Symmetry: C2
Subunit: 206 residues, 2 copies
């Protein structure tokens, strides 16, 4: 873990790791070393080596950063140059919205909501939108686009909406493209050993 | 001001009237200390607050302070004992119905994938979402404040409190509604026309 000043602005670089607990503590130690340099709303870009192996840790790293006063503006996929780590090779990026546990608006196409806890959206999640939540996700409206929950909580997390028309729903290590009935509040949860979707009135967890 | 007592109801933490919660929590911490190793981490106790109607919105923090100290509140006694309710010791996400005489107490948001029956109550430091029919009494924002919200698939509650505000009005039958603080009162509007 280390901060790099680049052409992309300030970037928190996290090298391939095995213990998330150490990364977070490294981030904290790294921040503390600056002696209160960051301002109330400062934004940073985030880059994790071997991202694919750590994608489910995104919500907790982004939240840990928020709990420290830093807003993650984008997630960068790429790597650093050998003898000039302040120069980045960005093969991909994704914007992150600055939101909290409760979102009182629509999550538009292109936007990505992140949170290590349960996310509650009082509005709709459009087709090109996405949610990465460590916990459960409830959209009090129409849910389209992708919703990935249980990224750090586990298979007990759930995904519900007043109209579960998602292109994809992930819950821990399970995925599915199935959708709920037209205008029928439904809940996507891990039952048996797959993600089952059933109306709110006929749900049966465990 | 604060003392434990063994009764036929089992261990009961008695909280005598107070003007400052911070003082109370400080007293519970000190009392816990006095009891020596009398208590085990799992230990469950009943809670009774004197002028209860005046400290209602403090339950989440008292219950939380006791929990963080190793004591689990199993029921809240009113009054010897006028009324009572079983505290549904659970998690942020409830996957069952909140039955009559049962009370859910949480410091943050509460999400119920079930219903909140008539004699049921929910004390939430944050927002409340009931993915089903909500009938009991829902008290939200007890910690976070006025920006907290209360929502249900069928908002037919006897009472709804949000921070210092209250209201007895309900939402249209079988219409996902949201109660929030707008203007300076609690407003209830369907999901498709909410304006925060």
């Amino acid at each position: 873990v280390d901060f790099k000043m680049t052409k992309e602005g300030l970037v928190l670089l996290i090298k391939d790791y095995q213990n998330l607990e150490e990364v977070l503590n490294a981030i904290s130690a790294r921040i503390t070393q600056m002696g209160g340099f960051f301002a109330k709303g400062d934004r940073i870009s985030l880059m994790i080596e071997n991202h694919n192996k750590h994608s489910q840790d995104i919500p907790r790293i982004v939240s840990h950063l928020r709990n420290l006063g830093l807003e993650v503006s984008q997630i960068l996929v790429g790597s650093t140059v050998e003898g000039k780590e302040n120069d980045l090779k960005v093969q991909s990026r994704t914007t992150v919205e600055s939101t909290g546990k409760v979102i009182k608006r629509n999550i538009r196409s292109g936007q990505t909501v992140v949170h290590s806890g349960d996310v509650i959206v009082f509005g709709n999640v459009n087709k090109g939108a996405e949610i990465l939540a460590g916990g459960s996700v409830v959209v009090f409206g129409k849910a389209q686009g992708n919703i990935r929950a249980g990224l750090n909580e586990g298979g007990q997390a759930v995904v519900a909406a007043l109209d579960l028309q998602t292109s994809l729903i992930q819950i821990a290590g399970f995925i599915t493209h199935s959708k709920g009935e037209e205008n029928v509040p439904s809940i996507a949860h891990v039952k048996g050993n797959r993600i089952v979707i059933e109306p709110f009135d006929k749900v049966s967890f465990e």
